[PDB]
Design a protein around this ligand. Sequence first.
Ligand code: HEM
Length: 153
Amino acid sequence: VLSEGEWQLVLHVWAKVEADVAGHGQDILIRLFKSHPETLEKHDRFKHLKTEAEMKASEDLKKHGVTVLTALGAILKKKGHHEAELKPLAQSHATKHKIPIKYLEFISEAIIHVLHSRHPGDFGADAQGAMNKALELFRKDIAAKYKELGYQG
Ligand code: HEM
Protein backbone atom coordinates (compact mmCIF):
# COMPACT_ATOMS: atom_id res chain seq x y z
CA VAL A 1 0.00 0.00 0.00
CA LEU A 2 1.31 3.44 -0.98
CA SER A 3 0.72 6.53 1.12
CA GLU A 4 -1.30 9.43 -0.26
CA GLY A 5 1.97 11.39 -0.46
CA GLU A 6 3.62 8.60 -2.46
CA TRP A 7 0.69 8.50 -4.92
CA GLN A 8 0.94 12.26 -5.34
CA LEU A 9 4.62 12.00 -6.32
CA VAL A 10 3.77 9.25 -8.80
CA LEU A 11 1.00 11.30 -10.38
CA HIS A 12 3.07 14.48 -10.34
CA VAL A 13 5.78 12.92 -12.48
CA TRP A 14 3.16 11.18 -14.63
CA ALA A 15 1.71 14.57 -15.54
CA LYS A 16 5.15 15.41 -16.93
CA VAL A 17 5.11 12.18 -18.95
CA GLU A 18 1.72 13.21 -20.38
CA ALA A 19 3.21 16.38 -21.90
CA ASP A 20 4.78 14.09 -24.53
CA VAL A 21 3.53 10.53 -24.22
CA ALA A 22 4.88 9.53 -27.63
CA GLY A 23 8.43 10.67 -26.92
CA HIS A 24 8.49 9.00 -23.51
CA GLY A 25 7.08 5.81 -25.02
CA GLN A 26 9.76 5.72 -27.72
CA ASP A 27 12.57 6.24 -25.20
CA ILE A 28 11.17 3.61 -22.85
CA LEU A 29 10.69 0.92 -25.53
CA ILE A 30 14.09 1.67 -27.06
CA ARG A 31 15.81 1.49 -23.66
CA LEU A 32 13.99 -1.80 -22.98
CA PHE A 33 14.96 -3.36 -26.30
CA LYS A 34 18.56 -2.20 -26.05
CA SER A 35 19.10 -3.18 -22.39
CA HIS A 36 17.30 -6.51 -22.74
CA PRO A 37 17.40 -7.67 -26.37
CA GLU A 38 15.33 -10.76 -25.56
CA THR A 39 12.26 -8.55 -25.09
CA LEU A 40 12.44 -7.34 -28.69
CA GLU A 41 11.82 -10.92 -29.84
CA LYS A 42 8.23 -10.70 -28.55
CA HIS A 43 7.44 -8.07 -31.18
CA ASP A 44 7.38 -9.49 -34.72
CA ARG A 45 6.73 -6.10 -36.27
CA PHE A 46 9.67 -4.45 -34.46
CA LYS A 47 12.57 -6.88 -34.12
CA HIS A 48 13.55 -6.01 -37.69
CA LEU A 49 14.27 -2.39 -36.68
CA LYS A 50 18.05 -2.35 -36.45
CA THR A 51 19.16 1.01 -35.08
CA GLU A 52 17.90 3.56 -32.59
CA ALA A 53 17.12 5.98 -35.42
CA GLU A 54 15.10 3.30 -37.19
CA MET A 55 13.18 2.69 -33.98
CA LYS A 56 12.49 6.41 -33.54
CA ALA A 57 11.27 6.73 -37.14
CA SER A 58 8.86 3.80 -36.80
CA GLU A 59 5.31 5.15 -36.49
CA ASP A 60 4.17 1.65 -35.50
CA LEU A 61 6.59 1.60 -32.56
CA LYS A 62 5.65 5.14 -31.51
CA LYS A 63 1.95 4.27 -31.57
CA HIS A 64 2.63 1.18 -29.51
CA GLY A 65 4.51 3.25 -26.93
CA VAL A 66 1.48 5.50 -26.51
CA THR A 67 -0.76 2.42 -26.12
CA VAL A 68 1.53 1.01 -23.42
CA LEU A 69 1.92 4.25 -21.48
CA THR A 70 -1.81 5.08 -21.74
CA ALA A 71 -2.68 1.76 -20.15
CA LEU A 72 -0.04 2.19 -17.43
CA GLY A 73 -1.18 5.75 -16.74
CA ALA A 74 -4.79 4.60 -16.36
CA ILE A 75 -3.64 2.03 -13.82
CA LEU A 76 -1.45 4.48 -11.87
CA LYS A 77 -4.29 7.01 -11.59
CA LYS A 78 -6.43 4.41 -9.78
CA LYS A 79 -3.91 4.50 -6.89
CA GLY A 80 -4.00 0.73 -6.37
CA HIS A 81 -7.71 0.28 -7.07
CA HIS A 82 -6.93 -1.17 -10.46
CA GLU A 83 -8.48 -4.64 -10.78
CA ALA A 84 -10.74 -3.63 -13.68
CA GLU A 85 -7.82 -2.07 -15.54
CA LEU A 86 -5.32 -4.80 -14.75
CA LYS A 87 -7.42 -7.84 -15.63
CA PRO A 88 -7.50 -7.42 -19.41
CA LEU A 89 -3.79 -6.61 -19.40
CA ALA A 90 -3.02 -9.79 -17.47
CA GLN A 91 -5.25 -11.76 -19.84
CA SER A 92 -3.42 -10.71 -23.00
CA HIS A 93 0.07 -10.72 -21.49
CA ALA A 94 -0.32 -14.08 -19.74
CA THR A 95 -2.22 -16.01 -22.39
CA LYS A 96 -1.32 -14.40 -25.72
CA HIS A 97 1.98 -12.51 -25.53
CA LYS A 98 3.48 -14.63 -22.71
CA ILE A 99 5.40 -11.91 -20.89
CA PRO A 100 7.11 -13.10 -17.74
CA ILE A 101 7.18 -10.91 -14.64
CA LYS A 102 10.95 -10.58 -15.20
CA TYR A 103 10.22 -8.67 -18.42
CA LEU A 104 7.85 -6.43 -16.49
CA GLU A 105 10.80 -5.72 -14.18
CA PHE A 106 12.85 -4.88 -17.27
CA ILE A 107 10.31 -2.34 -18.53
CA SER A 108 9.93 -0.92 -15.01
CA GLU A 109 13.70 -0.24 -14.99
CA ALA A 110 13.39 1.45 -18.39
CA ILE A 111 10.52 3.61 -17.14
CA ILE A 112 12.50 4.77 -14.08
CA HIS A 113 15.55 5.43 -16.24
CA VAL A 114 13.68 7.56 -18.79
CA LEU A 115 11.72 9.46 -16.15
CA HIS A 116 14.96 10.33 -14.38
CA SER A 117 16.72 11.23 -17.62
CA ARG A 118 13.98 13.61 -18.66
CA HIS A 119 12.75 15.00 -15.32
CA PRO A 120 15.53 14.92 -12.75
CA GLY A 121 14.17 17.98 -10.92
CA ASP A 122 10.80 16.27 -10.48
CA PHE A 123 12.12 12.75 -9.99
CA GLY A 124 14.47 12.74 -7.01
CA ALA A 125 14.93 9.98 -4.46
CA ASP A 126 11.50 10.22 -2.87
CA ALA A 127 9.70 10.35 -6.22
CA GLN A 128 11.75 7.44 -7.54
CA GLY A 129 10.96 5.43 -4.41
CA ALA A 130 7.25 6.17 -4.84
CA MET A 131 7.27 5.19 -8.53
CA ASN A 132 9.22 2.07 -7.65
CA LYS A 133 6.55 1.14 -5.12
CA ALA A 134 3.76 1.81 -7.60
CA LEU A 135 5.37 -0.40 -10.25
CA GLU A 136 6.12 -3.08 -7.64
CA LEU A 137 2.43 -3.11 -6.70
CA PHE A 138 1.49 -3.32 -10.38
CA ARG A 139 3.84 -6.30 -10.87
CA LYS A 140 2.64 -8.04 -7.69
CA ASP A 141 -1.03 -7.73 -8.63
CA ILE A 142 -0.52 -8.74 -12.24
CA ALA A 143 1.47 -11.79 -11.11
CA ALA A 144 -1.50 -12.91 -9.00
CA LYS A 145 -3.82 -12.43 -12.01
CA TYR A 146 -1.36 -14.36 -14.21
CA LYS A 147 -1.61 -17.30 -11.83
CA GLU A 148 -5.41 -17.17 -11.79
CA LEU A 149 -5.19 -17.66 -15.57
CA GLY A 150 -2.77 -20.57 -15.18
CA TYR A 151 0.40 -18.73 -16.20
CA GLN A 152 3.41 -19.07 -13.87
CA GLY A 153 5.65 -16.51 -15.56
C1 HEM B 1 4.04 -1.27 -17.93
C2 HEM B 1 3.99 -2.67 -18.42
C3 HEM B 1 3.19 -2.93 -19.68
C4 HEM B 1 1.90 -2.30 -20.10
C5 HEM B 1 1.07 -1.29 -19.39
C6 HEM B 1 1.59 -2.94 -21.45
C7 HEM B 1 0.39 -2.53 -22.12
C8 HEM B 1 0.11 -3.17 -23.46
C9 HEM B 1 -1.08 -2.88 -24.27
C10 HEM B 1 -2.14 -1.91 -23.83
C11 HEM B 1 -1.02 -3.69 -25.45
C12 HEM B 1 -2.12 -3.65 -26.49
C13 HEM B 1 -3.29 -4.48 -25.94
C14 HEM B 1 -2.89 -5.83 -25.41
O1 HEM B 1 -2.54 -6.76 -26.21
O2 HEM B 1 -2.93 -6.06 -24.16
C15 HEM B 1 0.21 -4.56 -25.51
C16 HEM B 1 0.52 -5.41 -26.52
C17 HEM B 1 1.61 -6.14 -26.51
N1 HEM B 1 2.62 -6.26 -25.60
FE1 HEM B 1 2.57 -5.04 -23.57
N2 HEM B 1 2.55 -3.85 -21.85
C18 HEM B 1 3.50 -3.88 -20.86
C19 HEM B 1 4.71 -4.60 -20.67
C20 HEM B 1 5.11 -5.45 -21.86
C21 HEM B 1 6.36 -6.14 -22.18
C22 HEM B 1 7.49 -6.01 -21.20
C23 HEM B 1 6.47 -6.84 -23.43
C24 HEM B 1 7.66 -7.64 -23.92
C25 HEM B 1 8.56 -7.09 -24.98
C26 HEM B 1 5.09 -6.72 -24.03
C27 HEM B 1 4.79 -7.43 -25.15
C28 HEM B 1 3.68 -7.13 -25.87
C29 HEM B 1 3.38 -7.76 -27.18
C30 HEM B 1 4.23 -8.74 -27.83
C31 HEM B 1 1.96 -7.12 -27.67
C32 HEM B 1 1.17 -7.29 -28.86
C33 HEM B 1 0.76 -6.19 -29.82
C34 HEM B 1 0.98 -6.61 -31.25
O3 HEM B 1 0.82 -7.81 -31.58
O4 HEM B 1 1.31 -5.75 -32.11
N3 HEM B 1 4.42 -5.88 -23.12
N4 HEM B 1 0.82 -4.17 -24.29
